[PDB]
Amino acid sequence: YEIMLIRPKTIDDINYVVDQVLEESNPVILDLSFLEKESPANFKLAGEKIKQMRSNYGAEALLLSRCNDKNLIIIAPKGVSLVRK
Amino acid sequence: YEIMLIRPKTIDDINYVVDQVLEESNPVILDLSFLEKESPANFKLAGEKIKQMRSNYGAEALLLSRCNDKNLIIIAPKGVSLVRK
Amino acid sequence: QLDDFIDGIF
Amino acid sequence: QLDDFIDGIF
């Protein structure tokens, strides 16, 4: 497979992540810092999409890093396990 | 596959990462902050192992985050593409 | 602004 | 202490 890397800025980027996780079954490493400070409405929307993916499709989501200008999340689809070691 | 998550502390943990990338073909998300401040010798060793993996085995390595107490790297084996979007 | 959509932290 | 073993930054 592939691991996609993105810093979402628009609703189209949020739909891009939904499609990689659910249609392509590709993990996505995404930085939510732009949405967080530019569009609080799209940041809430992005989070709702991640909640639905985990609740209904078995996706795992992990926070990797959280500092000024960075909010790194990894979303793995059902089929790719995030294994803590 | 699986994506392994580790904060290496010993040489055995460094050999663990070599084996996941090269034998299991699993990507590894690793935090090199412990080695960096506790064993500069093992931090250099860890970096040499990553250079050899990329040079001879086609592994990709990406820096995801670098702050106080964190140095997050992702190592993808030949077969898993890290795709910037 | 919590990340209340995660299953854990690295 | 550079990360001179990487192929790029996110």
Numbering used by the authors:
A (entry chain A), B (entry chain A): 65 to 149
C (entry chain B), D (entry chain B): 368 to 377
Pull verbatim passages from the article behind this deposition:
To further characterize the interaction between SepF and FtsZ, we crystallized MsSepFcore in complex with the FtsZCTD peptide and determined the structure of the complex at 2.7 Å resolution. The bound peptide is well-defined in the electron density for 10 out of 13 residues and adopts an extended conformation within a pronounced groove of the SepF monomer. The association is mediated by both hydrophobic and electrostatic interactions, the latter including 3 intermolecular ion pairs (FtsZ Asp 370 – SepF Arg 130, Asp 371 – Lys 115 and Asp 374 – Arg 118) and seven additional hydrogen bonds. Three of these H bonds are made by backbone atoms of the FtsZCTD peptide with the strand β3, partially extending the β-sheet. The archaeal-specific η1 insertion (residues 97-102) promotes the formation of a wider binding pocket compared to bacterial SepF and is involved in a network of hydrogen bonding interactions that contributes to stabilize the FtsZ-SepF complex. Furthermore, despite their evolutionary distance and sequence divergence, the structures of bacterial and archaeal SepF-FtsZ complexes share a partially conserved mode of interaction for the N-terminal part of the FtsZCTD (residues LDDFI in MsSepF and DLDV in CgSepF), which binds to a similar groove formed between α2 and β3 in the SepF monomer. However, the binding modes of the C-terminal half of FtsZCTD are markedly different between Archaea and Bacteria. In fact, in C. glutamicum this region interacts with residues from the two monomers of the SepF functional dimer at the α-helical interface, while in M. smithii it largely binds to only one monomer of the functional dimer, enlarging the monomer-peptide interface surface (600 Å2) with respect to that observed in C. glutamicum (390 Å2). In M. smithii, only the terminal residue of FtsZCTD (Phe377) binds to a surface hydrophobic pocket in the second SepF monomer at the β-sheet dimer interface. But a notable difference is the wider and deeper binding cleft of the FtsZ binding pocket in MsSepF formed between α2 and β3 through the archaeal-specific conserved η1 insertion. This results in a more important interaction of the FtsZCTD with the SepF monomer in Archaea than in Bacteria and could point towards an ancestral binding mode where a single monomer of SepF might have been sufficient for FtsZ binding.
Here, we combine structural, cellular, and evolutionary analyses to demonstrate that SepF is the FtsZ anchor in the human-associated archaeon Methanobrevibacter smithii. M. smithii SepF binds to membranes and to FtsZ, inducing filament bundling. High-resolution crystal structures of archaeal SepF alone and in complex with the FtsZ C-terminal domain (FtsZCTD) reveal that SepF forms a dimer with a homodimerization interface driving a binding mode that is different from that previously reported in bacteria.
